[PDB]
Amino acid sequence: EHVRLATTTSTYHSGLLDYLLPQFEKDTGYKVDVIAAGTGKALKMGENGDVDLVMTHAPKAEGTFVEKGYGVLPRKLMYNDFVIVGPKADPAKIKDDESVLDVFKEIANKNATFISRGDDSGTHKKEMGFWAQTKIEPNFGGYRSVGQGMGPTLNMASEMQGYTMSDRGTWLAYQNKLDLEILFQGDEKLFNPYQVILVNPERYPTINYQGAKAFSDWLVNPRGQELINGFRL
Amino acid sequence: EHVRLATTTSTYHSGLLDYLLPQFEKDTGYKVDVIAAGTGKALKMGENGDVDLVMTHAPKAEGTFVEKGYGVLPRKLMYNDFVIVGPKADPAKIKDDESVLDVFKEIANKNATFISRGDDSGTHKKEMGFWAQTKIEPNFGGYRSVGQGMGPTLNMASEMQGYTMSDRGTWLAYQNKLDLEILFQGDEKLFNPYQVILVNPERYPTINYQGAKAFSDWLVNPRGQELINGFRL
């Protein structure tokens, strides 16, 4: 029984779904096909009834989507909340930059110390996305890819007095033992609320509402949440 | 250093916050003082600026609270979705009851077989809250308080052909192996999306927005979510 999900290219490449889908299929017998595109296109496919539900991280676009009746039962999956931490003295002087892309470029061009998780985690993928957007390849001397989790990455950044990008949660749990501060967090790219929204079965009595609602229900119940969190750690 | 949180009686009595506040305090140093009441009063406390943030599970009332500017930065914290399942034959005849409270009262009165998690998890606490509202202590002999997880509880209900309360997510995972059906759902008490909402500093310039936002941020980040999920599983 087949469930078609439209989502973003970001999301597809993040690896999130590779973490969820196997368990969901094992649990329910549903097979999810992922079609990844830009946000407007993902939502358009939902508006056009090409897919059974959508997963995006664009609150304004999703608000209109629901308001016009294209989607129903919107649900928040997770709030991705990232911050840039570094030495209190901020030797790259990123503290007052405007965008996180300016922050990355500045760190690279000053060859400041930067610790990457380098472990293909969701956090690691997100860091790599920003480098890709800056058009810089993270090759500078200061750049260190340790191959470790968020906590050890923070410990490394404190030891070497370098910068890193952390989820706020790990930062808060560790700050008491880190010689670092939050130095930058003013960028909408750093905060991403995710929603999963069902295609309105009133608009499309033909779509697989039963399968789509099962996936959504599973995603927000503790079983799905355990896996989502596991991926975010 | 004191953050004041208004929440509902059921949330208070569930003990959810005892699993959270010590870790939040450990991480951030903030102390949260909790006041509990009915939904209307909980939100009224936010409206009056008596507390710094609110945590309720009443989407419509919360929408109004946000729309009027009483609260800002609303975030969905967790989705509760519970069903009452039992044998197709529904021998206790709860299928057509009106209220989940009626269902509970009817099961106790007929001394029907009912399987409780009995393990002080969130589901169990939710169940116990229902008993409390019916003013019944479940001591009838058909009541089994085993101390196991959701899957084993469902399996036992299926083997015994009795009733139990299940989150929908585990139900979706196990339903193919169980000789049970959903017999009662669609009572408002069974579906509760929680929201945390900050009291608006534009209304109350001296509100502890900093502490309240720290608690909110913490709740939606992976570390806080893992605590919440550990309680819910």
Same domain, A104 and A177: yes
Encoded tokens for B52: 């710094």
Same domain, B220 and B181: no
Determine contact, residues B101/B78, Cβ cutoff 8 Å.
no
In which domain, by residue range, is B222 found? 1-79+193-233
Same domain, A186 and A197: no
Same domain, A224 and A176: no
Q: Is A220 helix (H, G, I), strand (E, B) or coil?
A: helix
Determine contact, residues B73/B56, Cβ cutoff 8 Å.
no
A95 touches B: beta carbon within 8 Å: no
Cα separation, B215 vs A220, whole angstroms: 21
Phi, psi of B42 (to 5 degrees): -55, -50
Same domain, B125 and B200: no
Q: Report resolution (Å) to 1 decimal.
A: 2.1
Determine contact, residues A32/A25, Cβ cutoff 8 Å.
yes
Determine contact, residues A189/A81, Cβ cutoff 8 Å.
no
Residue B185 CB-half CA count within 13 A = 16
Same domain, B111 and B198: no
User: Measured between beta carbons, which residues in chain A are less than 8 angstroms from residue B221?
Assistant: 79, 81, 167-170, 172
What is the pairing mode between strands B163-167 and B114-116? parallel
A173 touches B: beta carbon within 8 Å: yes
A92 touches B: beta carbon within 8 Å: no
Same domain, A112 and A188: yes
Cα separation, A210 vs A29, whole angstroms: 12
Closest CA to B41 of B24, B63, B58, B18: B58
B223 touches A: beta carbon within 8 Å: yes
Which one of A229, A231, A232, A233 would you mutate to disrupt binding with B, by most B Cβ within 10 Å of its Cβ?
A229
CB contact under 8 A, B222 and A214: no
Query: How many contacts, defined by CB atoms under 8 Å, are there between A and B?
Result: 88
Question: Taking CA atoms, what residue in A is nearest to B195?
Answer: A76
Same domain, A90 and A188: yes
Same domain, A131 and A217: no
Other Cβ atoms within 10 Å of A156 Cβ, number: 18
A124: DSSP letter: H
Helix (H) or strand (E) holding B33: strand B31-37
CB contact under 8 A, A232 and B224: no
Helix (H) or strand (E) holding A76: strand A71-86
Method: X-ray
User: Measured between beta carbons, which residues in chain B are less than 8 angstroms from residue A66?
Assistant: none
CB contact under 8 A, B167 and A233: no
CB contact under 8 A, B232 and A218: no
Same domain, B146 and B111: yes
* Residue appearing with tokens 């890709």: A132
Determine what percent of chain B falls in helix, strand and coil, rounding each to the nearest 5: 45, 25, 30
User: Measured between beta carbons, which residues in chain A are less than 8 angstroms from residue B232?
Assistant: 222, 225
Same domain, A100 and A113: yes
Total of domains in chain A? 2
Which one of B177, B215, B225, B227 would you mutate to disrupt binding with A, by most A Cβ within 10 Å of its Cβ?
B225
Same domain, A198 and A106: no
